């Protein structure tokens, strides 16, 4: 019942579209489980791979609490 994120016919995550990517991190900086944000089955994987690539080149934080 929770609408899928990819209603817009998106194909490639590209691990750089940080605007596109902020929908799924925790307001603290963690990751949000599928059942929480109601996402796909193969979409749950590439999301994580993208953001893990991003968390190395600095385009995203590891910890955002301070």
């Amino acid at each position: 019942k929770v609408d899928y994120i990819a209603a817009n016919h998106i194909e490639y995550i590209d691990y750089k579209d940080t605007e596109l990517l902020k929908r799924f991190i925790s307001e603290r900086g963690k990751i949000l489980p599928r059942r929480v944000t109601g996402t796909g089955a193969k979409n749950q994987r590439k999301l994580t791979i993208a953001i893990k690539r991003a968390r190395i080149m600095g385009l995203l934080p590891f910890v955002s609490d301070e």
């Binding site: 690539r53 190395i56 080149m57 600095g58 385009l59 995203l60 934080p61 590891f62 955002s64």
Partner: protein, 97 residues
């Protein structure tokens, strides 16, 4: 056939105007001379970082796409000089599909 690559890397802010260009062209060269087809180069964005790396908080984001055969040494030679250089913070080669 031949695969695809996106080689993004970081450059410090304290660069000059010439050093940047000489570095970029030098890497273009060492890319070519090992059988790469350097398609294009760009400068993504003058960005800061969400956390420091060594003594920096910002860096220039350059990027080049290149194709080559699999046994083409045009990648090993790149990383053999990127990670031993000085003005480059990090980098990440990725297959592009």
């Amino acid at each position: 056939q031949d695969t695809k690559y996106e080689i993004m890397y970081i450059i410090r802010p304290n660069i000059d105007e010439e050093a940047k260009t000489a570095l970029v062209e030098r890497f273009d060269t060492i890319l070519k001379d090992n059988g790469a087809e350097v398609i294009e180069s760009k400068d993504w964005e003058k960005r800061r970082l969400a956390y420091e790396m060594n003594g920096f908080r910002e860096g220039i984001y350059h990027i080049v796409n290149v194709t080559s055969p699999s046994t083409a040494g045009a990648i090993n030679e790149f990383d053999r000089l990127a990670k031993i250089n000085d003005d480059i913070i990090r980098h990440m080669i990725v297959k592009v599909e």
